[PDB]
Design a protein around this ligand. Structure first.
Ligand SMILES: Cc1cn([C@H]2C[C@H](O)[C@@H](COP(=O)(O)OP(=O)(O)OP(=O)(O)O)O2)c(=O)[nH]c1=O
Ligand SMILES: [Ca+2]
Ligand SMILES: [Ca+2]
Ligand SMILES: [Ca+2]
Ligand SMILES: [Ca+2]
Ligand SMILES: [Ca+2]
Ligand SMILES: [Cl-]
Length: 901
DNA sequence: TCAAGTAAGCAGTCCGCG
DNA sequence: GCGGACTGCTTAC
């Protein structure tokens, strides 16, 4: 077995390392690590160490780590560059693990825990920790067991033991429906007092010390609460037993306004799952309560109880404990699905960083690039301080608001990383500058050729062509991984569509799902077998196919975020390789590439239609073009096509055989023009959109930049069983618009694109007729709530007070004096509802914490005073009017014109 | 809302616009 | 009432 680190810390002049040894065993060592740093020396000195620019460097070996830090300081006082890895943990891992790390996840202790704390006087502040901890469920990945620590006696109630048999049975039997598949995995431990529970929990922690510590909100609540509670009862030294090296810190953590407190446990890698979810899931939720996310991800029903959570333990301790266990399992289930822990470890070990540093792309890329350079004996530069400066980004084309019947989109593969590689954009590859012409001149190939020797970007930057920079070299490796996993993702997606087709025809039999790998396109034998399968087996296969696709999406999209992170990090002042010359070289080249290809695609299509000046490209954002295919369809049919799938094949054949070769010729020319290192602008067909053949649908529409809808039949080679709506930027896509409204707007769009104007007018009429029956939560807007206490002034809306903030102040006033009423937490999401004039709340809106029912006292009143009229015109009618106006449609008839008869 | 980047939309406040 | 300066929030890349 090859060895791998678990955790690494610097504590004074010692590196503290937990690792897995050659025998598969967890181990700990304290290494008195002697770091090296570098200084420029004259050429006279024969050395093997060179900076990234090829300047000679002398290596400086320090007695300890504090000596290395003092030298960096004194080099600053002198005014000279101190080169090398100043994060000595990273240098240590580089020296100790001088190879590609193969890790074994089965040897890494991943702990998933949740605590319960009964609080009769509001939220229990983790930094006070004044209330007893009365439940801890702690799952261990190695044991595969849920360890339940249950307080039977508290100042808030003496309770009976939790019954495992009641927990197992249905809600309909008096039970808690704790999943069968985990019942045998529960190790249950009741305690007579909190001191006993906490002492036992600390002994347990010692024996099964987390490497990865996760859960929901554990970093902001669970961890600091357990730490401070133990600290209040036993002292600081006992609290510090949560760290394997007995060292903890705070932390702080900004931003403005104001600041939080977390506990840094040295030798643990805390990956709060809420944080993993926000970084990697690529959703924006109305609520981040576990229950909301569990419903969203797993389609599991909200685990319900009577009364408030502060009375739950004394009124129903059985359910209290059972829900603590289910809370932990929920997070494991979301991970089984999303695989964010797996992803974190992959990226973390790849980069050779503390695993928790996957949260910082700057940290991740600094470690990768350092390790790539160290391998060649090259020395990294000192990080400098830079003033934050704005710089330009992508080009977005203004669309003409309209409907568009037949649409084909084309999209550049990993654009920004592909520009890095093509141009050879890197800190050490800068060759100089050239006199820049207006961008428009490069777009039209009218400017003089920038260089005959170097590789250029239209921002004026020239780059070496003899060898690849460290940025191109390393961005390529992660790009190639991204491409691998995207393949598995798209194949899984395609395999899912074959199952959906076969679901049109079971096959009334008792059989089993096929043992297949969904990452690969189903063979003809698997296809045959699928066509003989029951609905039960086919649905189970769909679930599994869709799970593979999710797994592929996680792996692919976050490797993409990482590489896009690097292009972005070039424009972040805290990045070691921060250069605005390079950041702009990427974005300017991208602007040219899009507008260059727009010109070429128009020219091509104008040529192959016999026209001049006609604009076939109707829109583009950053790296995408949207081509109007009406004239291509018109040249053939629609006479003339058997079905929808027939013109979708014709357009797929035309895009792949005629257009892409022309796009590639267009891009090969631009590469020569810029004299780039290698041609890497690959623009594949993305979507084929249009109305169902023979229908009165409009196919798609644009309202403006970054706001559009299309009816897609084929996406990147996935031919759908049913057409899919691709809606971008419109209100159906915003977390802020109500659930019921998003749904309603979506069906309006669907009818517009697939069925026509009259189908739209009948749905709108029906929705307007029934919308007052909708549940208040389903029709409440959502906003994030920043700067509440600023507005307020005091406590009414102050000058320029935002609408949602006003609603919160209304809420604050209606719940004034209540300890147990839910407080609106600053920086979180709220539900917002408009209020009718003359209401007892004395303002036009009320807001409350999202993902929650509003307090029983006031609920009846807001429900009574809810302004449905304002609600409808604001969230539904205004947006819908914007759609139909853009699409040249009416949601209301209109005319009409006969009229009676 | 600690944690790579810019572009650009819409809601609402405030206030002009004879 | 609408739009523009401005803040707040949110999304497309
Ligand atoms: C999504 C996204 C894009 N971008 C920039 C960089 C991208 O190259 C460019 C286009 O974005 P995308 O079209 O979303 O993705 P991509 O071209 O990088 O890769 P692919 O299409 O194969 O999925 O916009 C970011 O800087 N950050 C982001 O989060
Ligand atoms: Ca792209
Ligand atoms: Ca693509
Ligand atoms: Ca069949
Ligand atoms: Ca794109
Ligand atoms: Ca070339
Ligand atoms: Cl790819």
């Amino acid at each position: 077995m090859k060895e791998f680190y678990l955790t690494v810390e610097q504590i004074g002049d010692s590196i503290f390392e937990r690792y897995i040894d050659s025998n598969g065993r967890e181990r700990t060592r304290e290494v008195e690590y002697k770091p090296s740093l570098f200084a420029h020396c004259p050429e006279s000195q024969a050395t093997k160490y060179f900076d990234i620019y090829g300047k000679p460097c002398t290596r400086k070996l320090f007695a300890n780590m504090r000596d290395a830090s003092q030298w960096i300081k004194r080099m600053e006082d002198i005014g000279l560059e101190a080169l090398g890895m100043d994060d000595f943990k990273l240098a240590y891992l580089s020296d100790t693990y001088n190879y590609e790390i193969k890790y074994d996840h089965t040897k890494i202790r991943v702990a998933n825990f949740d605590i319960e704390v009964t609080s009769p006087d509001g939220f229990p502040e983790p930094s006070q920790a004044k209330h007893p901890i009365d439940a801890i469920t702690h799952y261990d990945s190695i044991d595969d067991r849920f360890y339940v620590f249950d307080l039977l006696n508290s100042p808030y109630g003496n309770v009976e033991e939790w019954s495992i048999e009641i927990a197992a049975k249905l809600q309909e039997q008096g039970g808690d429906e704790v999943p069968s598949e985990i019942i045998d995995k529960i190790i249950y431990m009741p305690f007579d007092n909190e001191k006993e529970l906490l002492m036992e929990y600390l002994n347990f922690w010692q024996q099964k010390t987390p490497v990865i510590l996760t859960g929901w909100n554990v970093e902001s609540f669970d961890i600091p609460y357990v730490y401070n509670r133990i600290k209040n009862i036993f002292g600081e030294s006992t609290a510090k037993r949560l760290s394997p090296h007995r060292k903890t810190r705070v932390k702080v953590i900004e931003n403005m306004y104001g600041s939080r407190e977390i506990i840094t446990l040295f030798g643990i890698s805390v990956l709060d799952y809420i944080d993993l979810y926000k970084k990697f899931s690529f959703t924006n939720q109305p609520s981040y309560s576990l229950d909301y996310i569990s419903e969203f991800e797993l389609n599991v029903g909200k685990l319900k109880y009577d009364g408030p959570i502060s009375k739950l333990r004394e009124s129903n301790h059985q359910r209290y404990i059972s829900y603590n266990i289910i809370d932990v399992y929920r997070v494991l289930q979301i991970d089984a699905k999303r695989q964010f822990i797996n992803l974190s470890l992959d990226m973390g070990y790849y980069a050779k960083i503390q695993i928790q540093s996957v949260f910082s792309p700057i940290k991740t890329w600094d470690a990768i690039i350092f390790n790539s350079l160290k391998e060649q004996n090259k020395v990294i530069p000192q990080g400098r301080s830079h003033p934050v400066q704005p710089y330009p980004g992508a080009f977005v084309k203004e669309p003409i608001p309209n409907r568009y019947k037949y649409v084909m989109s084309f999209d550049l593969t990993s654009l920004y990383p592909s520009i890095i590689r093509q141009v050879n954009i890197s800190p050490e590859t800068i060759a100089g500058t050239f006199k820049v012409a207006p961008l428009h001149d490069y777009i039209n190939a009218v400017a003089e050729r920038p260089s005959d020797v170097y590789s250029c970007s239209p921002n004026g930057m020239m780059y070496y062509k003899d060898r690849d920079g460290v940025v191109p070299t390393e961005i390529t490796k992660v790009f190639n991984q991204r491409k691998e996993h995207k393949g598995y993702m798209l194949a899984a997606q395609r395999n899912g569509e074959i199952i959906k087709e076969a679901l049109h025809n079971p096959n009334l039999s008792v059989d089993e799902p096929l043992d297949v790998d969904y990452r690969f396109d189903f063979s003809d034998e698997i296809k045959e077998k699928i066509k003989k399968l029951s609905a039960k087996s086919l649905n189970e296969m769909l679930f599994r196919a869709q799970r593979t696709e999710v797994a592929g999406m996680t792996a692919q999209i976050n490797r993409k975020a990482l590489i896009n992170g690097l292009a972005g990090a070039l424009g972040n002042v805290w990045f070691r390789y921060y250069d605005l010359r390079n950041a702009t070289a990427i974005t300017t080249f991208g602007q040219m590439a899009l507008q260059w290809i727009e010109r070429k695609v128009n020219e091509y299509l104008n040529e192959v239609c016999g026209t001049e000046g006609e604009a076939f490209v109707l829109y583009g954002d950053t790296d995408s073009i949207y081509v109007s295919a009406d004239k291509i369809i018109d040249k053939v049919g629609e006479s003339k096509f058997r079905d929808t799938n027939h013109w979708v094949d014709f357009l797929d054949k035309f895009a792949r055989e005629r257009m892409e070769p022309a796009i590639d010729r267009g891009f090969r020319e631009m590469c020569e023009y810029m004299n780039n290192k290698q041609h890497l602008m690959f623009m594949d067909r993305e979507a084929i959109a249009g109305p169902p053949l023979g229908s009165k649908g409009i196919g798609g529409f644009w309202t403006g930049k970054k706001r559009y809808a299309l009816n897609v039949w084929d996406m990147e080679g996935t031919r759908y069983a049913e057409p899919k709506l691709k809606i971008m930027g419109l209100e159906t896509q915003k977390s802020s618009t109500p659930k019921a409204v998003q749904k309603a707007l979506k069906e309006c769009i669907r009818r517009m694109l697939q069925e026509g104007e009259e189908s739209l007018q009948e749905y709108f009429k029906e929705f307007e007729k029934e919308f007052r029956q909708l549940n208040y939560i389903s029709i409440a807007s959502v906003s994030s709530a920043n700067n509440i206490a600023k507005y307020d002034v005091g406590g009414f809306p102050g000058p320029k007070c935002p609408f949602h903030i006003r609603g919160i102040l209304t809420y604050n006033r209606a719940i004034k004096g209540n300890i147990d009423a839910p407080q609106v937490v600053e920086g979180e999401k709220v539900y917002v509802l408009p209020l009718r004039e003359g209401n007892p709340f004395g303002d036009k809106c009320i807001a409350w914490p999202s993902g929650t029912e509003i307090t029983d006292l006031i609920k009846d009143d807001v429900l009574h005073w809810m302004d449905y009229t304002v609600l409808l015109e604001k969230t539904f009618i205004k947006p819908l009017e914007g759609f139909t106006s853009a699409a040249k449609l009416d949601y209301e008839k209109k005319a009409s014109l006969f009229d009676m008869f």
